[PDB]
């Protein structure tokens, strides 16, 4: 019954915000609201967008600067801005294009793509859309170790060059939303069907994680390192004790995140930990962070505060409603270009630059 | 004529804050707004919620857990969550099975009931629901020492392991609701009758209050210890030297609460209070905590900082009027899967492990 | 044309804040805005309002108290309770018994009155009215000399027992409500008619002249409590005068530490501006008042009930305060001024 | 596009209503492009909120009256600590434009700052100036020739300093520019929606060694908010700092200007004056300005609403309000003079605009 959007086209990108209201009047409601909502009353949620304004940014003069470079490199990738997109589940929610319109976007704008194992689209249908484009794969773990190999061999066979396990949710957030409007997927998971009780098809997202792996380990990371041969981030890192565990168990990379707050509620806003996480990693791995990311600023701020690269996710599924892989790609265009003027106005010439920025501590919070 | 619910039956809970406008509809008006209601405007209430959001959970990843276990052990009873009901005066005025409902559903669920001395029902009427569970009893002193000596020994010959000594209500807080909606009790007290010069039911709250003890001292403190030969909490505790004063008087555990913000206005939320009393307290004895528990985020908080119990009130007496034993049995219910999902993401095993969990400052306030 | 209310009755009060929405339907437009309103967007008098929860009461168990004193002592008064009636001139915008029916319910309840010179009503109006209570007296400094030795003798003839200088006042505050109402005062007996070169010799000065202990009202900094108290003060008042003067200033309960610690107790310290609760009562001490002065609260009493509705507003903050001691384990005025308070870093929205 | 064109004074009871007043007389494009401010305005809102960090005292037997609002800048006696702030294309507000404005600066008393993208000529606002002191400001070419031949037409007018704003090397993020396709209706002849483009990117210290090397004139640097750039800016031949935002209209997620300038003021050390601009509505903001390090403010939107009401009269009406609003806080602070205002005490509000 589901009536995703299929109308394909460039959008109008005054700013991020602007795009959830009006993907709201094309989705429809049980899944535009499993896209939007998080758990609680969301408090964590308007917590990772008021971070930002913890730290503000300087303007900067006669800082010699002109064309700012966007381009930067992560894990021997070449990428055209300093973000990424986050892997996120189901984008057939969002369109009827799904995970291909994304990775088309994606793989046009020249960044990496991270498939979601709950994606609704197979390794075949998201690999048509790349055209060839660099993909990680993001695992939520089987119980099975096999079914782990097979996914994993499965994952590297398609061409992915990095692996991230997110380890956030192993069991769901207390989404609201979903449970009052009884949120169930209109179609299945065909990456990780096998250890499912049938399809994803008429479940609750309650009870497909948690098919998924509760008990992991730090284990589990030297395993999967160990089997794919491939980079491994953990995800989902919002304490510094847990970045040196990734690390000391084989880690290749750190990703800062809350899971855009649908995951443990009355927790920090994303932005606020990653000081302390970065001082940890103490550069021994790249950092992504995410959750919350909506503006050039945001870019900017997580960078000059340890991370390496961000990764996009709400407003590019918005975008991805409103015009399909046309429409995601208005938002990754948006955000070159918003962080183009910010690293003007800052002083920054290249992205290392940003990586140096000072920051202006505001005590005073949002109400200033 | 108070036309209280009557209807027994299991109630969904998607959280606790919902539970409140939902027996509006069903409980009378003086009544509910009674149960409802705060001193002042109400700020302190207010504030008893926002602190919880003073102090913010890490999700921690690859800890090593599953299937957490909720069960603890307090003065030798074995609960089957960290959470016991809190002592709360006449449980008819949310549903006809008044206190002997409430009792069931304590009972059942597997955690103590505390009995107000200003309950509407008898010990015989409660004993029934109970069938035999633990139960403390809560006094709120006679002036008249022969009476207090025959309250307790009542108590203990109904099977009370614990006695409670309120001490924070030795005048009635300026509750608004109340005066503006003259409200009275439309049944007896049939513990307290004794010290009331005729009966609860004509009566003001301010004047039951008032025949009550005001010149409490910590001698008291050790004459119901002396006498029942039961331990002793004290409860309202706010102030660390309060707890060195209980402890000195010959308590047995120290009971750090503010009435739900019914007592004195303009005061901390009770959470904020909390760590200063047991870095005072010093594991010498057990400390149960209240005030604005209604998720299992603040359970799991409140022991990070401290205490040993949370005691459970509103939320369950809502859940009363909403469906009777059943109805509060959903709230109990609700809270142990509440507290079990937040074990599971912030590395909790069990009880034990949520006492030593980091808790992140968040120096900005609810606006962040 | 002025038409204040008239009527005369005991009010119930739950609480003073609901007094002023209750007031403003029974007192004409402009003269209830001249009450009401302070200066600017009123940002300050909000933050009179909003510094209490600054510093926050703890309740307090098994303390020995039964039936809490609230009676004090202030430069020889005994009063009932440790507020008293700050000087407000315009008491007749209010109710037609203007400045003689708050008279009244002060005396009836046992504290002092302060009386301006300013006000609506007759010197014998209002004595009939404070049968036999005391009474301060307070003023402006007039630019001429003469005017300020007749006045300070017409004051002590009138039986006062102290003088308040006002002098935060040297101009008027920028009140928008009272601009934009055009309003006009209607009675008789302006800040730009009298003295605008306050120096400290003019407190020695009236200091020298009436035989009265001198308070210095409006002080928010604490060198002036200095400065005032080497120039033969006998008490600081400490007030922003309800926010009507200087805009973009601190809450007054804000200021009031720092400058209980200049003052050392050398002299009484008279608080107001924002008082609305026995909880501010208490707090005010705590911080190092010996008094708090009321003002608007009385004032909507006033409008509502006359003599009595102002009587029920006094009522009301002595029984508020006397559960506020209760609970706080404070048997008496001397215990609320030794009270611990919580700091709260969060403010208001906490 | 319908500029209004009525001139009078005007009531000014506060200069926020004034905004408000203005939009049922400004053309819905040209309103909007002075109004707004980047993204969701936070920033601007920061800019106006700050006031409430630090607040004034009132003080007591003080000795005070007739308090003199008048000072001196560079050479320059103006009646109040206040000076007009460059702000482009006048002729959005009133008809009159930059002369409108230039008269009643003029008249008023103080210090009119021209900006390189008016719409008025040189002669044009020379005659609402009738000799009235003047400065130029300079949104830099890329072609250093058409610079001096700038900053040479500027000097032969009669400017006394030059302001060099380097904050705006491309434009800030207005989201009602954006919405409303905002484009200028006319001519903009010192520099003759993708201006700033053709203007310098590429801004050094080299570039204002160079003004002032080539220009007879003392040089402001201007969009300040971070103190190492006052230091580079002196250290370049700067004879002046000023402490700027843009009004918000420039980098979004900064701080509101008025929290940057005890830091600037600290580092500038008193070696050259400094201008404060940036949310300034109140006599109580000059004082607090002052008394944290600024030696004048620029007043900018109160003005241009003044403007847009009254003409000349109008923006006069404005100036008057901030000086007469001035001199009242002047009496309650017990401040005789400026430099009084200059050494004020201030509360500090650690609790936010919300307390
Ligand atoms: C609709 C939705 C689905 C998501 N699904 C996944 C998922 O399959 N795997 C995963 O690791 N993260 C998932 N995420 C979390 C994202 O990877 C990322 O952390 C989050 O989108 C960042 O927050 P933001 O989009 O508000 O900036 C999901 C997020 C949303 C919005
Ligand atoms: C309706 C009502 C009645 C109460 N009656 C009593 C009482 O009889 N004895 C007592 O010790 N505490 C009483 N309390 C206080 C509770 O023991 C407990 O402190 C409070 O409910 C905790 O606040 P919360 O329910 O908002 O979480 C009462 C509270 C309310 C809600
Ligand atoms: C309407 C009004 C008139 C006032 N008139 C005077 C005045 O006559 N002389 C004076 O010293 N203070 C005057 N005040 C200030 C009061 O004495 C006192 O400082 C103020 O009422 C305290 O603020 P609050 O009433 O909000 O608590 C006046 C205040 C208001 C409300
Ligand atoms: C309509 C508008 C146009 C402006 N144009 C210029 C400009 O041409 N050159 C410049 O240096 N500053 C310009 N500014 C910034 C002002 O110089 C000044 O920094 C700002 O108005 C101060 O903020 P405020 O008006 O909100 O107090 C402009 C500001 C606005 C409101």
Redesign the interface.
């Known amino acids: 019954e589901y009536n995703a959007p299929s109308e394909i086209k460039y959008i109008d990108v ?2 991020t ?1 602007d795009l959830e209201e009006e993907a709201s009047k094309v989705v429809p409601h049980g899944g535009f609201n499993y896209i939007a909502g998080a758990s ?2 969301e ?1 964590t949620k ?2 990772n967008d ?5 730290k ?12 700012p470079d966007t381009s930067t490199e992560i894990l021997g990738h070449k990428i055209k801005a300093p973000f990424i997109m986050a892997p996120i589940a189901a984008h057939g929610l969002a369109h009827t294009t799904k995970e291909a319109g994304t990775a088309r976007a994606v793989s046009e704008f020249g960044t990496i793509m991270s498939i979601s194992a709950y994606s609704g689209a197979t390794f075949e249908e998201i690999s048509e859309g790349l055209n060839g484009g660099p993909r990680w794969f993001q695992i939520y773990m089987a119980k099975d170790d096999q079914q782990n190999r097979d996914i994993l061999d499965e994952a590297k066979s398609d061409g992915a060059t990095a692996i991230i396990l997110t ?2 949710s ?5 989404r ?1 939303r979903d ?2 409007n009884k949120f169930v997927y209109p179609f299945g998971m065909p990456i990780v069907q096998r250890y499912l009780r049938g399809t994803a098809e008429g479940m609750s997202l309650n009870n497909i994680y948690g098919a998924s792996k ?5 284990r ?2 030297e395993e999967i390192a160990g089997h794919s041969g491939l980079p491994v981030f ?1 995800k ?4 510094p004790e ?1 970045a040196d ?2 690390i000391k ?1 084989g880690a290749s990379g750190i990703w800062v995140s ?1 899971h855009g707050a649908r ?7 994303s932005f ?2 990653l000081p302390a996480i970065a001082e940890r990693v103490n550069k021994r791995v790249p950092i992504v962070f995410d959750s919350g990311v909506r ?1 050039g ?1 945001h870019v900017a ?1 997580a960078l000059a505060s340890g991370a390496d690269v961000v990764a996009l996710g709400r407003p590019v599924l918005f975008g991805l409603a409103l015009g399909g892989w046309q429409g995601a790609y208005s938002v990754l265009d948006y955000f070159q270009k ?1 962080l183009t ?2 690293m ?3 002083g920054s010439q290249n992205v290392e630059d940003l990586k140096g920025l ?1 920051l ?1 501590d ?7």
Chains 1, 2 share one sequence.
Do not use: C
């Open positions: 005054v700013n915000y609680g009353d408090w308007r917590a008021r971070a930002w304004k913890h503000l940014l300087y303007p900067r003069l006669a800082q010699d600067v002109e064309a380890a956030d192993t069991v769901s957030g207390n609201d449970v009052k509760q008990k992991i380990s730090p589990d990371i953990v989902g890192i919002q304490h847990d565990m990734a168990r809350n995951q443990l509620y009355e927790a920090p806003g606020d930990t503006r600023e701020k918003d003027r910010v003007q106005l800052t000072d202006f505001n005590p005073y919070g949002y109400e200033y």
